[PDB]
Amino acid sequence: MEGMLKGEGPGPLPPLLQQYVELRDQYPDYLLLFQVGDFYECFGEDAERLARALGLVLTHKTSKDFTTPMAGIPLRAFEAYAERLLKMGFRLAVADQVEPVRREVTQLLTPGTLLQESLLPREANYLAAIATGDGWGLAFLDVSTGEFKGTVLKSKSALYDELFRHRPAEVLLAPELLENGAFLDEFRKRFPVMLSEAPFEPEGEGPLALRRARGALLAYAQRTQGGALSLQPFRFYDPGAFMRLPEATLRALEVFEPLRGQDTLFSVLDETRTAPGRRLLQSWLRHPLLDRGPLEARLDRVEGFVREGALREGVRRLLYRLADLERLATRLELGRASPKDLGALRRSLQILPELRALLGEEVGLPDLSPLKEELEAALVEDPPLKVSEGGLIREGYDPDLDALRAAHREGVAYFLELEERERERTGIPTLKVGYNAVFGYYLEVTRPYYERVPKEYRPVQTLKDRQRYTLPEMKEKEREVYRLEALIRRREEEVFLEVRERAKRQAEALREAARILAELDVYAALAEVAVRYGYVRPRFGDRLQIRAGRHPVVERRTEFVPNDLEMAHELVLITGPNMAGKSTFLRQTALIALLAQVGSFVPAEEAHLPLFDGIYTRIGAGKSTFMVEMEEVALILKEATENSLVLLDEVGRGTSSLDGVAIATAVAEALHERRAYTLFATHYFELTALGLPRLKNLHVAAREEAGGLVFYHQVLPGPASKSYGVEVAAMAGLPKEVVARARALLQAM
Amino acid sequence: MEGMLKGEGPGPLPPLLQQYVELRDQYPDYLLLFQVGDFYECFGEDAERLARALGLVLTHKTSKDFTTPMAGIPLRAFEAYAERLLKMGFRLAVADQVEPAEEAEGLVRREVTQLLTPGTLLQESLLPREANYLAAIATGDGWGLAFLDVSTGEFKGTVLKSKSALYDELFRHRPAEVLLAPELLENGAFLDEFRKRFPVMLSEAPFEPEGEGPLALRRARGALLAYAQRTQGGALSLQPFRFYDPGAFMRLPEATLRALEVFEPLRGQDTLFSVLDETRTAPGRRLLQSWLRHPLLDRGPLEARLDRVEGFVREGALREGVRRLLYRLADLERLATRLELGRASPKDLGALRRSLQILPELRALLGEEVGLPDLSPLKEELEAALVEDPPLKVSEGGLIREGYDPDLDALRAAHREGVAYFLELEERERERTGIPTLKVGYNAVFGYYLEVTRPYYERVPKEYRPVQTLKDRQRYTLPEMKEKEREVYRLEALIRRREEEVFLEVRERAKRQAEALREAARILAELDVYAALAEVAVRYGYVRPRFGDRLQIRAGRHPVVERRTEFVPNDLEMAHELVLITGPNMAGKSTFLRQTALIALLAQVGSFVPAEEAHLPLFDGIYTRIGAGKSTFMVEMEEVALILKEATENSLVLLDEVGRGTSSLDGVAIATAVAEALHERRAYTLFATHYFELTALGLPRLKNLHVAAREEAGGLVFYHQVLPGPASKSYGVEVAAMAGLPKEVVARARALLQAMAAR
DNA sequence: GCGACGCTAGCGTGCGGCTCGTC
DNA sequence: GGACGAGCCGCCGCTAGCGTCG
């Protein structure tokens, strides 16, 4: 309700609450955080919301004709609370007091539009918009980076995969999608991301669905940033031009996220030193390449750093904790760079010369020494972006500012002398000089010396154990001091703005530097990983031949038994007992293929790999488990080509015996005919004898050693000759009698 | 070593910081809250911990010698802050000022008054309605397991033969804190197993035996008593120790409690307990939970519980009346304990009086036979002693009513007269001086005073003694006032004393009835449960179950699922039979299994059940292997083993697709051997499976049931009706086609099926 | 030949109570 | 000329620093 506040009493709202309600109504989609002193406050129903969400203590804001509930949080703890509130589904509108009893919204906090470094992860934070037309328009925006890109997908499936691959923090759905109760529930069940409203008026040229999705991002984000956004050129892209990595595949392979128990492929490759670099590597992983040319070039760069140890080590040492120049450039362009930002920037530009001396001219790094010297001359060594927005420009930089401060230092020195002269003249070694916004400059005497205070003194305020007096010659000195403090804050602000502007003019140079370094960062990190964990440079061809391949994530935890693999558009069945590494073997094959097509060396002794058009998996655990799996099998059968890598794990399970085998056979045959590279781990000895021309068998076995049965992870040629289902049951502690019947029945069958 | 506070600067440690550091080191695993005035403070790293843990401002305590970090919280909101600290995983050692500052040989006396740990909480605001158990596990002629609920005095334990049974006994109690015997802490392999299965806080306590009986139990009990007496800061209030036998009740393994979502949900969804519980009091919710934790095996007591339930189902007016009255009943059991332990607050006495005023009304409804204690005499003293709405602390406003205690009334009277004096003074001086706006005011810093504004400064009489100068006002003092002020202060100080003395005297009056309070609490808790189960029965349409050796359920339903969706009722007849249920998934086979266990669970708790009619046997335990070693196959085989070793002819066994996870033949073979053993065992077994092969075994007590899917206008429609006989067709391929498998692949699969099946 | 105390401002968690400026 | 922002003083107990007894 507009202008209405929840509480008791008649009378209109007092000034403070009126100002609050007015602001609160200009942003109905957000929780308004109103600054009141050292706190951010919410009133009425909003207080109750903040209180319950954060477990705060509800109080009251009372005036003569109205009393309303109240809850707030300390300014000092803002970021911490904002983060929780954002994660909790809240959208925040921040109203701060405008420097010299007047509040204004300074920030509009939304999960997908965050611009504060402190509330962001190193990785890209995307805002995504979806709209219809000829197919699906999908567009992404990273306000902190300016990254702006999109595409058009023909099927809902492809859309969902493109969406998932980017893990957006917030989604804007077109009106025809928000009204579609069918889509909405399907969408909310699959993507538990915050959904926000936005007008989908078209923008720019191209497919209408894209023009619209793009219109929504811009309109919504501009609102969040209170005006013009700082975006890089919108980039249209074709998912079809890269290796396909559906959601199911990304999850099963734990590329970016763990299924259960930490450690992902990305964490193992987590060796970059800079945020732009981590971002770039994530970008490459997200969309692996299909073209040999660019891949071979990337591999050369990595090989370069592997051979040039001193250089590699030199670069990595220098990039350590280097500031995110790309996001800094964005904060500058938007007129939001803080004094701290400029401090971080000058520090970064002091490292730049070192990187270039090491890297050389061909690298193309910009020379920003002029900017560096300016920041070195202008800023205090530790810019107090927060300490007051003052005490920022160092002495010596600006003459007008220096003169004012010097005038001020004398005023302060004056009162220091006034104090000494007075405690010598009065004999009160305790006599003090202090200032207060209310009484200004005064003299202070403790209770024990009240009878030594001269009569010239005019008492002005009495406290518990002391009293403050005044002296005729003190007034003019006070107001002059206050006059100077105002002039100083004002001048120092002007200088900061001028300094900040000079840094702003170099924004493109900053982005260019950030980009070149991000690449260097990635190549050097892939090289370090390769050298550190023993990775080799892959070679591309039609046949897949891997010697001593290992699962890159798993081997970092235990001693890994490497395995070989040779495939060429074949249906490879892997029989044998579970707990023998069959699953990890399928996954490691996929990870080596993914790494190679990203331009990284791989965990093997030798690896000849084809350039897959995609990796499709059916691995791991209202709709039953069987139907979920059949749905995944359906997508594989519909998307896999002769150039796809397909990984199936126990496909066919979860139903009756016969239907189960009939299904896996039909699926196996379809894949055998598709000419895809298929690794099918199964228990169906029956599939092992289909006799199709490109059908190949492999298996793992177990041996009842000292323990009673030890599963060997060595992948062996030919099909499994034995079944250990019963033996495992016997090992599980199932009654000997029951184990015996099973064997009897097993053989009897 | 330890005895040094973190902080920069050389020199010694200030006296206070010494008194602080001394106590701190005494409780290495607790966060010490050191009372200093109206704040509980922490120094050094501990101040750092506290500050970040609660997001407090981090200051410092400077002294010539050196300065150290400092963080603190006002005593006002102690419990609120502790609540937070507790939930973060901290243990708290509370050090208060034991000696009034008004008389201390320098440094105020400070000692640890109590420890706050998850399993020994006594504060109402830090406790859940449910029982809060401290548990202790030890060895010594079996596995000793003992529990203590310090807030109620519940004190019980038992000995178990295996580790499996120990763990299950522990789980059904969901302890908040566990004390492990030294040997178990020493046993590295045990500890890890324990930590993984039980994420609960582990604490240290000595395990010197206490009392008589099995060593293991005497040790666990000793641990509970040594630990709780320490935390409580004194002698505990305990109910007679109960050495019970879990074998005397229905067995409910952890796997079962979890699979049936009795107390905890699997997917955020409701719980049997959340649905069943409409209890009005905490003692009642606890009693109901206790009954669910250990369902009975005895027909007689069960029929008695059902009689009381049925009685409240019929007598609607009485049922709603009792529930209306109970709604306002405080927790008299926990109130009794606080009374006995000398912790009862003026707030507790208010709640006590309110409850005792309800007592006679309930007695009037249930009649003079429930055995409810007559406590009107205590009620009257409370009514005559405390103001209508009692304050939180005796130190402030009037806790005690006027006319109750003469000493106090004499004191208050003189205070009223002392205050009137100043009001009269303001009027006397306004006329004497002629300054109309003159005022007599007061503030804690200057005391009472005369106030005149700037326009009358040259009008102030010579007698006025300047006291406080303000911007445009000046305050003075007259000799007569100084005297009177000191008087008002003396009265105020005497009033706080006498009033606290009266509170304590009244509290002691209540404490003497602690036992009657517990007794009234037990009776009402039981009635709360019976009326509550009747309430649920009437609201959801449940019926009274009959006990026999045959299980005969007509139109039964899952009591929880039906709560959020239209449920299709189903029948079931079973008599020590192996019941196989074939058919596709998504047709309610699992729900059918679970509803069976829940109906049986509810009946053995003395509750009506969700069905049209239910004839039920008395099961000795419910064993499940539903949903959910390293391999999936191996894990399920382990569960099956436990089931085969504990299952009896009186057990209800629920198997969900046992045999999955391996090869064709091995799967069917294992499923068969398991089926035959359970058939031989004669337990009541419901076995949901896809194996048509199991439907034709040569077993005399094997019965077939199934669910079916229907290929209609939509594609495939699953029917939740449980049908007689085995499935006549498989729907795997159809479901696959429904999942989107391409037509030709589905077609090829059908062709393969018809060729295979065609031998 | 300086240890023992007397007296008393200063000081700071979170934040009540009190002041002051404005209208 | 009452009512409403807005911001400071002190709390309660301990201490350093003096100002002295003997």
Curated annotation (Swiss-Prot), chain A:
This is DNA mismatch repair protein MutS. This protein is involved in the repair of mismatches in DNA. It is possible that it carries out the mismatch recognition step. This protein has a weak ATPase activity. PANTHER family: DNA MISMATCH REPAIR PROTEIN MSH1, MITOCHONDRIAL, DNA MISMATCH REPAIR PROTEIN MUTS FAMILY MEMBER. CDD domains: ABC_MutS1. One of its GO terms (biological process) is mismatch repair. InterPro entries: DNA_mismatch_repair_MutS, DNA_mismatch_repair_MutS-lik_N, DNA_mismatch_repair_MutS/MSH, DNA_mismatch_repair_MutS_C, DNA_mismatch_repair_MutS_clamp, DNA_mismatch_repair_MutS_core, DNA_mismatch_repair_MutS_N, DNA_mismatch_repair_MutS_sf. One of its GO terms (molecular function) is mismatched DNA binding. Belongs to the DNA mismatch repair MutS family. Disulfide bonds: none annotated. The gene is mutS. Keywords: ATP-binding, DNA damage, DNA repair, DNA-binding, Nucleotide-binding. ATP binds at G576, P577, N578, M579, A580, G581, K582, S583.
From Swiss-Prot, chain B:
Belongs to the DNA mismatch repair MutS family. InterPro entries: DNA_mismatch_repair_MutS, DNA_mismatch_repair_MutS-lik_N, DNA_mismatch_repair_MutS/MSH, DNA_mismatch_repair_MutS_C, DNA_mismatch_repair_MutS_clamp, DNA_mismatch_repair_MutS_core, DNA_mismatch_repair_MutS_N, DNA_mismatch_repair_MutS_sf. GO terms for molecular function: ATP binding; ATP-dependent DNA damage sensor activity; damaged DNA binding; mismatched DNA binding. ATP binds at G583, P584, N585, M586, A587, G588, K589, S590. It comes from Thermus aquaticus. Keywords: ATP-binding, DNA damage, DNA repair, DNA-binding, Nucleotide-binding. This protein is involved in the repair of mismatches in DNA. It is possible that it carries out the mismatch recognition step. This protein has a weak ATPase activity. The keyword tRNA-binding does not apply. It holds the Pfam family MutS_III. This is DNA mismatch repair protein MutS. CDD domains: ABC_MutS1. GO terms for biological process: mismatch repair.
